[PDB]
Subunit: 305 residues, 3 copies
Amino acid sequence: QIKAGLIWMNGAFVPQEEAKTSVLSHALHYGTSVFEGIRAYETAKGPAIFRLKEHVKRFYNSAKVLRMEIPFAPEELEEAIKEVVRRNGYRSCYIRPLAWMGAKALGVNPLPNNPAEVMVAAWEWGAYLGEEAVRKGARLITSSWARFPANVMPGKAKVGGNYVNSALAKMEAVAAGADEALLLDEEGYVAEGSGENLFFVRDGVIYALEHSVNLEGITRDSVIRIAKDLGYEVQVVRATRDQLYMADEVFMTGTAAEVTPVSMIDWRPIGKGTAGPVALRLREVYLEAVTGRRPEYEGWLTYVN
Amino acid sequence: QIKAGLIWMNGAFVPQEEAKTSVLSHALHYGTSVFEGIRAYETAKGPAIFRLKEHVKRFYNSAKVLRMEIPFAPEELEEAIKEVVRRNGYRSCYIRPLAWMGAKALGVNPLPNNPAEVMVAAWEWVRKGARLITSSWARFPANVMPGKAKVGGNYVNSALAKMEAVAAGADEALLLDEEGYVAEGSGENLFFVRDGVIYALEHSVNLEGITRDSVIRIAKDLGYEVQVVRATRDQLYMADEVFMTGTAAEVTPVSMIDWRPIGKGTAGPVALRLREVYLEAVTGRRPEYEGWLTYVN
Amino acid sequence: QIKAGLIWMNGAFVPQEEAKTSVLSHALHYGTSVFEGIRAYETAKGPAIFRLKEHVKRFYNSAKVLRMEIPFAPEELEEAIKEVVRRNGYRSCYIRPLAWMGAKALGVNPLPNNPAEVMVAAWEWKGARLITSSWARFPANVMPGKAKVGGNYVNSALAKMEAVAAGADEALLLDEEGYVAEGSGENLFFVRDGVIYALEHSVNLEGITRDSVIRIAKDLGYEVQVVRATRDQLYMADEVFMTGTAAEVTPVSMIDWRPIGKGTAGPVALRLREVYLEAVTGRRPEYEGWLTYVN
Ligand SMILES: *Cc1c(COP(=O)(O)O)cnc(C)c1O
Ligand SMILES: *Cc1c(COP(=O)(O)O)cnc(C)c1O
Ligand SMILES: *Cc1c(COP(=O)(O)O)cnc(C)c1O
Ligand SMILES: [Cl-]
Ligand SMILES: [Cl-]
Ligand SMILES: [Cl-]
């Protein structure tokens, strides 16, 4: 499977083969888990975790939505997140904290299963997209699956069950020949990708999409701050698929996707048909920030060493 | 059970006992009435009615939505509201102006019943925070009921929600709109605070609160950044603070929603400061906000 | 019929009489066409087309929504538009560019019909009373509301007919959720306590007149906010007005038989309208950039 190595399991690191849970775990049956996507980027000062506290804060916030009790102080989880990097001797890596309801009972109500089991795993990237691919840009296709209304699934939380919607949309997009899916909300407005927030640029202005039913991305937040620091005007608005069709540029953000320009949506080219200068510039500054080359953004980094 | 005393009835004051209307009144059958909630607070210079002008304007605006004709000039209603306070010797009181379609006919169309009958009555009138529960009743879409007006019929929705919330052990209900976003309480506008920024909910299908308006101005004067946004229930769950505003509720901190504590689980500093400046304003202790007060004496 | 005169038909001008297309044209059966509305106003320096490039850009943008191919460069279309005014001797006129899918086939899919055929035609050019329509403007995933696609106007046509039959001048469409959207072909604004409120784009077309009015309003010193609005927010507004190439800035004095403010055209709407007219007729140096002098 995934080459994670030593995994933190409820308080102590164990070999990957020991990082297993009962197949009767509530979360494996009812999607009652919460997770985070965190990255450590190598610097000449060792690995630096990007916006660790903001991600951990969201982790506990997601748990609160499910009334899930995480039996560890945020400080303990933060230490575990730094340790999973050190103990495995990783430089750059992806970190996946997970809290899930165990196998105490299988009634749909997860309360009797509290407190939640928790683990932190991390693994290295197999490959990265090169500048050629980034410039060609991602191709999106609008999904036939709508992102869930705000009173159907908790869209501000990274709750496991939520991703059945993301999985269905992603599979559909790939089957259609696209790189990613663009989900609309039930009313017909653009929501977000299967796991990425959307932005578009028109006549010099950068438009971030309102939160609506989307997750409040930390990369999105980072990109907006960076854009403003560079002197760009940033507006937050609700958008339709055809506002994106006629945008000068479109790009998406996410911990895994960083800043990814989108060159085509529903087989309709965006602007020049390749990544545009704004998205390529934002991506560069963002990468400079996460890899510790921007003193003004060092506050966002937590050095493991 | 209400100790209203002298009530202004279509032009003249009469004892509470005499303030009655036909049970064939259109409004008692079809909810065709409009009302307001106005408060008078005691100050060093006597009772002061808070934002009288704004409330009366909305009273007439609500009537317009129903194509209801109020047979009095706003100035006359304003005098009656001041008199209801004076004549009853009130200082701190709740004032309830009410215009309703009468008993001329009972066809559902209220036009034949114009002009409306009008009456004005009044009666003498935290850190733990209020507990809310999200309702199973959604606030009406903007093309179903006039959500910007205080129309009587609208409150069947509020009544159902409030009843459900209290039965569930909460202090107030939090209504969502039909699309699933947060709307407002049964009779209060909502706000939340996150990372130092105050978020006032967009008007959407909610009533444009005068207390909400007041709080925003106060917040800005204090130096807080205020953003007007649409919000989901979980954005509130993760807020540092959340509070409600309304004439009766003033500025009320909300410490818990759906049994999920908000922030520290007790009233937060921001909501408390806004409430304090608001109470200072309505009691005549803020010169910069004196324009909002109408002194009875 | 319309007194268009010489019409540009896929590259060359021909008498109106010859400006015809097969009744088997895809667009005549399935609404697969795109168009624009552009005006030329007389100025001291001759006819001037208002914001020509922005309109042409939207024309091509509308085509992209339908994956329609326009076999001419924007520059060529812009020249044709200027020429339709010159050749016909027009001073103040309405210009109607149109790109439509032809008669190559009649399967609903329009791709086999590309490239589109194109034509450019032109003709010399109290407060409105509105009634809220029983037809909702289409959701953003039902019809492309940011594009001037022919088929979209069946919705506008139905709303307009209803409004007129009800005794009003124009229709006010709500979106499916119940919020105000726009008129059959005009963007909406309202004024309350000195502030001008432009409606968010939601499912509406991004009007060029709306854009011009917002800039003018800001330049005059007005505070402008962009919001979502309900019908009763309009009922209680001090003023309500709508914008569009044909409607310019039109004040709205009544909605659903409920008077707006004074019940007559208000000062803000009337002023924006007058300043807009001054801009399009070349009397405001600050807005000269928006004009294209034909001569
Ligand atoms: C994780 C996630 C994102 C991206 O948020 P980041 O904090 O930028 O990683 C966006 N949308 C969804 C649905 C997500 O789960
Ligand atoms: C009266 C009312 C409010 C609060 O408005 P205030 O002007 O602040 O008193 C909020 N929501 C509803 C539904 C109301 O009826
Ligand atoms: C053309 C149109 C408008 C007006 O836009 P302008 O660019 O100002 O002419 C508004 N709504 C619709 C549906 C339209 O087709
Ligand atoms: Cl397609
Ligand atoms: Cl619960
Ligand atoms: Cl009516």
